[PDB]
Design a protein around this ligand. Structure first.
Ligand SMILES: *[C@@H]1O[C@H](CO)[C@@H](O[C@@H]2O[C@H](CO)[C@@H](O)[C@H](O)[C@H]2NC(C)=O)[C@H](O)[C@H]1NC(C)=O
Ligand SMILES: *[C@@H]1O[C@H](CO)[C@@H](O[C@@H]2O[C@H](CO)[C@@H](O)[C@H](O)[C@H]2NC(C)=O)[C@H](O)[C@H]1NC(C)=O
Ligand SMILES: *[C@@H]1O[C@H](CO)[C@@H](O)[C@H](O)[C@H]1NC(C)=O
Ligand SMILES: *[C@@H]1O[C@H](CO)[C@@H](O)[C@H](O)[C@H]1NC(C)=O
Lengths: 539, 230
């Protein structure tokens, strides 16, 4: 079945996006059509995965006879699957025998005849709370077009035999011919591996049907369905032959243009008009300039002064293909907290064709560039910061990628005074360096690291989350693994890398509960119980 | 303190080129626009283009776009204005102003008189209005279009060019008065009509008042009312 996602211009676009459609994955909306211009533009539609909004239609007849069912995945306003209103004389939705979710709204239709007598009881399903059908079973057009009553368990409209393999429209999904409650799972449990495994017979979900792979440009989501595009919290990534909607690692890639190229080609800095154009933005394409004109304001460019609280918009930036110039910062902030998440400064286009990181003449105590790890092309100049203390500690040669890069840290707070005022980084910090006064602002640390912050040592013997050390880092092991005082509660990651499990253990993997009711091999559910030794045994 | 110094005392010939400097001191010269404004005799102040010393990105007026070149000297903190193909009407007084944040041309250069010889129209309803010391005066100004900028801030300004000195900002906004000027001046108006109301005319108040707009691409001044004592 083919699928789809001035008044003259409206009809053309509508007919274009609906002439070949047979199953609509979205909402069928026929609105604003002029007199005597509809001519079999949409007659083959048999399924709408959403709501059917036929509003303000001057045409005498909107053909929708084949329409078998409206899914109701969306609504017009609320619980509104069929929205026929303010139109239209003949609307023969004869095949319409089911509206899973939503109700039909009848309003402002004086010309609509032969539809007030329709049996909406057989179509609308359990959504009568908002059924204002107020504007003999026959949709119209004399005979032939009748309501074909059938209602007044996976077949929605009707049945053509007492078999699930033969029905008009499946209530939930249709693998290839039989009506299934859900699509074959993509993960299959195998008692031999005591865990989940990719299921070959498992098929992705394509709207109201199950497909081994989704054709055209569709992206499989986490729950097995392949929607048209990945969500806001997900990104498109193609591992195997089909791309999948992998979850974004926090704020994922949103490449915007920086200062010098694009809409900010003639802009000088990130002033108030610039701010908000960098919201939830990562991997700036261009340079990032923060000049005094931003906070002072500019009259010639007609830009109000940038209030310092809007500088947190740049907290999303994790890469800058150009350079970072901070010639002005709010004086009430002791560090560049807007660039704490910045990780790479490619420097492709550097200040004066030289500096890619330039913190100049600021009133900040620390740099606050904890996540900064790579400065590829340009060098670094941190000067004029009369209150900058933890600046020379960082081994800049580690971040640099090109051997020719240098660093011009000069005229900041003296190191002698820096250590005299008690402003020396934490002892939990490898000589590699420190970005600030706390272990969070540490390039590297003496023994371990719990994320950005690094403690004295992992919870190998005592601790609340009971970390286990690996590659000089604290990893909180599976919660299932109970704390162990004699040795280390957990050898490694996963529920199969600890000596003692607080909850039951399925084979080698400690689990909250033994696997019960999960789909297993040969399309058979598997259930497991627990013995006195907390081991999960197959039933 | 901020102090902008121009070369001054320039005399040229028609068809020649003149270049004047602006030694800007007391502040970071690269953090502020360096506007250039001309005051031809018989006419009010006329904007002729600016420059951003931090990057050298200059803007221009349509009457000087193909005729004037402005370049900055970052190391010595001095902006320049080169006017070529001088005509008979090019004789004027050239000021190197300095754009602020809520206002325009906070500080002005003393002025360079280049005497050479062989757009939202802002018009002030009065012209050379005489008053008596003590009696309140009122200078109205009419704009050709609505100068309320899209951002919601109208860049209406009143400049008092006292005899022998450069223009000085009095009302930095439609009504917001500048720092260092008395409460006597009180700008007023909205939309298209703007009037400046002096509550008490004093001896020092004599001078030419120019209603200025900066909300359009070319900033334009008004003809100027020569307020004088009766
Ligand atoms: C403030 O940012 C805006 C852009 O957001 C800059 O305004 C641009 O200015 C150039 C000329 O300098 C014009 O060609 C663009 O059309 C303007 N863009 C917009 C959106 O108005 C402005 O320069 C910035 N101000 C400072 C002081 O950097
Ligand atoms: C510039 O930074 C300094 C410190 O680097 C600020 O001085 C601090 O002001 C805070 C205000 O809460 C005091 O608690 C500190 O004791 C001060 N520290 C020092 C070392 O003097 C100074 O105020 C900043 N300048 C501003 C905000 O204009
Ligand atoms: C940016 O993305 C975040 C993600 O949480 C969202 O909440 C926010 O509204 C977005 N901002 C804009 C301006 O689109
Ligand atoms: C590990 O921690 C101990 C105790 O705090 C400390 O003395 C030692 O220096 C650390 N190891 C390294 C390699 O720095």
């Amino acid at each position: 079945k083919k699928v789809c996602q001035t008044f003259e211009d409206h009809f053309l676009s509508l007919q274009r996006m609906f002439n070949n459609c047979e199953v609509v994955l979205g909402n069928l909306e026929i609105t604003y059509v002029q007199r005597n211009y509809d001519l079999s533009f949409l007659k083959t539609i048999q399924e709408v995965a959403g709501y059917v909004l036929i509003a303000l239609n001057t045409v005498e007849r909107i053909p929708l006879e084949n329409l078998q069912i409206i899914r109701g995945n969306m609504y017009y306003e609320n619980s509104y699957a069929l929205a026929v209103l303010s139109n239209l004389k003949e609307l023969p939705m004869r095949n319409l025998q089911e509206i899973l979710h939503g109700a039909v709204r009848f309003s402002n239709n004086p010309a609509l005849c032969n539809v007030e007598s329709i049996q909406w009881r057989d179509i609308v399903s359990s959504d009568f709370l908002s059924n204002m059908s107020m504007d003999g079973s026959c949709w119209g057009a004399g005979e032939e077009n009748c309501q074909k009553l059938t209602k007044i368990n996976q077949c929605a409209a009707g049945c053509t035999g007492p078999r699930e393999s033969d029905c008009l429209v499946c209530r939930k999904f249709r693998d290839e011919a039989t009506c299934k409650d859900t699509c074959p799972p993509l993960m299959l449990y195998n008692p031999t591996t005591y865990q989940m495994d990719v299921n070959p017979e498992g098929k992705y979900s394509f709207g109201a049907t199950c497909v081994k792979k989704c054709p055209r440009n569709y992206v499989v989501t986490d729950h097995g369905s392949c929607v048209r595009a990945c969500g806001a919290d997900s990104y498109e990534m193609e591992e195997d032959g089909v791309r999948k909607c992998k979850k974004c690692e926090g704020p994922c890639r949103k490449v915007c243009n920086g200062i010098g190229i694009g809409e900010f080609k003639d802009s000088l800095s990130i002033n108030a008009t610039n701010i908000k154009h960098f919201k939830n933005c990562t991997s700036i394409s261009g340079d990032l300039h923060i000049l005094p004109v931003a906070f002072r304001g500019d009259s010639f460019t007609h830009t109000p002064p940038l209030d310092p609280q809007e500088l947190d918009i740049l907290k999303t930036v994790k890469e800058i293909t150009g350079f970072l110039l901070i010639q002005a910062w709010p004086e009430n902030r002791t560090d560049l907290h807007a660039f704490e998440n910045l990780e790479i400064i490619r420097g492709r286009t550097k200040q004066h064709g030289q500096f890619s990181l330039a913190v100049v003449s600021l009133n900040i105590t620390s740099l606050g560039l904890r996540s900064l790890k790579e400065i590829s092309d340009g060098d670094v100049i941190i000067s004029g910061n009369k209150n900058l203390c933890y600046a020379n500690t960082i081994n800049w040669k580690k971040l640099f990628g090109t051997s020719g890069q240098k660093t011009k840290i000069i005229s900041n707070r003296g190191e002698n005074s820096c250590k005299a005022t008690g402003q020396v980084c934490h002892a939990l910090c490898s000589p590699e360096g420190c970005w600030g006064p706390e272990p969070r602002d540490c390039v590297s640390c003496r023994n371990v690291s719990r994320g950005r912050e690094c403690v004295d040592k992992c919870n190998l013997l005592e601790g609340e989350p009971r970390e286990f050390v690996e590659n000089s880092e604290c990893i909180q092991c599976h919660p299932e693994c109970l704390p162990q005082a004699m040795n280390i509660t957990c050898t490694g990651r996963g529920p199969d890398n600890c000596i003692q499990c607080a909850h039951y253990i399925d084979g080698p993997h400690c689990v909250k509960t033994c696997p019960a009711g999960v789909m297993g091999e040969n399309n058979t559910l598997v259930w497991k119980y627990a013995d006195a030794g907390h081991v999960c045994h197959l039933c | 303190q901020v102090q902008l110094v121009q070369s001054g005392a320039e005399v040229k010939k028609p068809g020649a080129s003149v270049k004047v400097s602006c030694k800007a001191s007391g502040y970071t010269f690269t953090s502020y626009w360096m506007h250039w404004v001309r005051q031809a005799p018989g006419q009010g102040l006329e904007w002729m283009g600016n420059i951003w010393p931090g990057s050298g990105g200059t803007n221009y007026a349509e009457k000087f776009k193909n005729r004037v070149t402005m370049t900055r000297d970052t190391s010595i903190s001095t902006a320049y204005m080169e006017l070529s193909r001088l005509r008979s009407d090019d004789t004027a007084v050239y000021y190197c102003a300095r754009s602020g944040g809520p206002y325009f041309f906070d500080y002005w250069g003393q002025g360079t008189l280049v005497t050479v010889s062989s757009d939202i129209v802002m018009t002030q309803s009065p012209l050379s209005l005489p008053v008596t010391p003590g009696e309140p005066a009122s200078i109205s100004c009419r704009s050709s279009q609505n100068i309320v900028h899209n951002n919601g801030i109208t860049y209406l300004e009143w400049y008092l060019q006292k005899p022998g000195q450069s223009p000085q900002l009095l009302i930095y906004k439609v009504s917001d008065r500048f720092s260092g000027v008395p409460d006597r001046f009180s700008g007023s108006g909205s939309g298209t009509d703007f009037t400046l109301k002096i509550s008490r005319v004093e001896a020092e108040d004599v001078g030419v008042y120019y209603c200025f707009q900066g909300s359009h691409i070319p900033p334009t001044f008004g003809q100027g009312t020569k307020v004088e004592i009766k």
